[PDB]
């Protein structure tokens, strides 16, 4: 029985993304109470670019240390971290206490993300069935970044401050029991083979190629999220609940757009999914500035969603599959560059986006955008396969 692994799997991609995202809403009031006790002040942006950062920063590592004593240890270690980190940003009073707490949930994040893609990718040896599931695993990213911040409102709002965290913590304490359930994390057991170190993957031209589409399709929406309500205040006036209900289509999409590409790309071909993502998530954003009220930025925010959901849960599977044919099977040092594309575009995207939009315009940050996506789409046809 490997779905237990498959379980484990999606339910600690679900609990990082609901804890980043939890995070969000809640601490710029917070930061405020306490200070009197844009949309990002040169302080609160940190406490968002600092669970990436730090992630980005300890994937290459994590990648190594799997290949030396394997994952268990490493997922196991990747809980008991969150679980600590929840209870300490739960109880914390401080900023700098804040910003600690946002750096272990990242070096946590990235432990069990790399780990669990790597034991996925390791028990699911089939391309077929690797692609399937790894469609459902990554579901649930898209899944805790939907119900995120919902959740931490409405417990913020009933029961207090500490509720949404306490819960949290102990869903993660759920499941690590589930983990010592079934993994056991005993002993340590080195693997079999050497690694293929990333500087010889990182001169590879398709890993580059299929990470290059990951981080650019990604880092559309990275920086579409932040500056769209900001330009919506100015050239609309909408009202409070209208730049909450505008972004509601994204997730929605990006949820579906996953869990069916997952299954579907298999048959059209992965290469001509990514190329159809990369064309229709650029048309989406060159078209976005055009709206008038919400009724206009109704349907590009689905495309945009429905097209990362393509190229992502196309762009997985295929690392795997590159590694298999022309290296060393081992995927914990592949999918740490599979992880460092999504963690730099959150990284550094609402600072670039803001500044870039202040500087020449969302029209033209839009459609750079665009361009970009656009320019880069041909290059996914070196992806075919030779047959």
Same mark, same amino acid.
């Given at each position: 029985?490997?779905?237990?692994?498959?379980? $484990?799997?999606?339910?600690? @991609?679900?609990?990082?993304?609901?804890? @980043?995202?939890?995070?969000?809403?809640?601490?710029? +009031?917070?930061?405020?109470? !306490?200070?009197?006790?844009?949309?990002?002040?040169?302080?609160?942006?940190?406490?968002?670019?600092?669970?990436?950062?730090?992630?980005?920063?300890?994937?290459?590592?994590?990648?190594?240390?799997?290949?030396?004593?394997?994952?268990?240890?490493?997922?196991?270690?990747?809980?008991? $971290?969150?679980?600590?980190?929840?209870?300490?940003?739960?109880?914390? +009073?401080?900023?700098?206490?804040?910003?600690?707490?946002? +750096?272990?949930?990242?070096?946590?994040?990235?432990?069990?993300?790399?780990?669990?893609?790597?034991?996925?990718?390791?028990?699911?040896?089939?391309?077929?069935?690797?692609?399937?599931?790894?469609?459902?695993?990554? %579901?649930?990213?898209?899944?805790?970044?939907?119900?995120?911040?919902?959740?931490?409102?409405?417990?913020?709002?009933?029961?207090?401050?500490?509720?949404?965290?306490?819960? @949290? #913590? &102990?869903?993660?304490?759920?499941?690590?029991?589930?983990?010592?359930?079934?993994?056991?994390?005993?002993?340590?057991?080195?693997?079999?083979?050497?690694?293929?170190?990333?500087?010889?993957?990182?001169?590879?031209?398709?890993?580059? !190629? #299929? #990470? %290059?589409?990951?981080?650019?399709?990604?880092?559309?929406?990275?920086?579409?999220?932040?500056?769209?309500?900001?330009?919506?205040?100015?050239?609309?006036?909408?009202?409070?609940?209208?730049?909450?209900?505008?972004?509601?289509?994204?997730?929605?999409?990006? @949820?579906?757009?996953?869990?069916?590409?997952?299954?579907?790309?298999?048959?059209?071909?992965?290469?001509?999914?990514?190329?159809?993502?990369? !064309?229709?998530?650029?048309?989406?954003?060159?078209?976005?500035?055009?709206?008038?009220? !919400?009724?206009?930025?109704?349907?590009?925010?689905?495309?945009?969603?429905?097209?990362?959901?393509?190229?992502?849960?196309?762009?997985?599977?295929?690392?795997?599959?590159?590694?298999?044919?022309?290296?060393?099977?081992?995927?914990?040092?592949?999918?740490?560059? &599979?992880?460092?594309?999504?963690?730099? %575009?959150?990284?550094?995207?609402? +600072? #670039?986006?803001?500044?870039?939009?202040?500087?020449?315009?969302?029209?033209?940050?839009?459609?750079?955008?665009?361009? $970009?996506?656009?320019?880069? &789409?041909?290059?996914?046809?070196?992806?075919?396969?030779?047959?």
């Amino acid at each position: 029985s490997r779905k237990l692994i498959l379980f $484990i799997v999606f339910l600690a @991609l679900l609990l990082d993304n609901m804890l @980043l995202t939890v995070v969000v809403p809640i601490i710029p +009031s917070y930061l405020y109470s !306490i200070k009197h006790e844009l949309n990002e002040n040169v302080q609160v942006g940190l406490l968002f670019a600092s669970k990436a950062t730090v992630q980005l920063i300890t994937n290459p590592f994590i990648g190594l240390l799997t290949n030396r004593i394997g994952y268990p240890i490493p997922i196991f270690a990747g809980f008991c $971290i969150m679980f600590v980190s929840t209870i300490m940003f739960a109880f914390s +009073s401080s900023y700098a206490f804040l910003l600690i707490a946002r +750096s272990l949930q990242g070096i946590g994040s990235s432990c069990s993300s790399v780990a669990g893609m790597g034991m996925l990718a390791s028990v699911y040896t089939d391309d077929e069935e690797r692609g399937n599931v790894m469609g459902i695993a990554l %579901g649930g990213l898209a899944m805790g970044v939907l119900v995120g911040p919902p959740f931490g409102s409405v417990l913020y709002e009933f029961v207090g401050k500490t509720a949404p965290f306490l819960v @949290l #913590a &102990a869903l993660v304490l759920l499941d690590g029991a589930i983990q010592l359930f079934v993994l056991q994390p005993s002993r340590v057991q080195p693997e079999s083979q050497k690694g293929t170190p990333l500087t010889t993957l990182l001169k590879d031209p398709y890993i580059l !190629i #299929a #990470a %290059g589409s990951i981080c650019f399709a990604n880092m559309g929406i990275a920086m579409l999220e932040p500056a769209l309500p900001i330009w919506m205040m100015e050239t609309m006036c909408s009202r409070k609940w209208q730049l909450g209900v505008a972004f509601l289509p994204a997730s929605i999409s990006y @949820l579906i757009g996953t869990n069916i590409f997952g299954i579907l790309a298999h048959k059209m071909g992965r290469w001509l999914c990514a190329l159809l993502g990369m !064309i229709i998530v650029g048309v989406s954003i060159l078209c976005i500035p055009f709206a008038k009220n !919400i009724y206009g930025l109704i349907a590009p925010n689905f495309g945009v969603g429905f097209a990362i959901g393509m190229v992502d849960s196309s762009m997985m599977p295929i690392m795997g599959y590159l590694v298999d044919l022309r290296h060393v099977s081992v995927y914990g040092s592949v999918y740490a560059i &599979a992880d460092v594309a999504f963690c730099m %575009g959150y990284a550094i995207g609402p +600072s #670039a986006g803001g500044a870039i939009a202040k500087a020449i315009g969302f029209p033209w940050l839009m459609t750079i955008i665009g361009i $970009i996506d656009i320019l880069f &789409a041909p290059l996914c046809f070196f992806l075919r396969s030779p047959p």
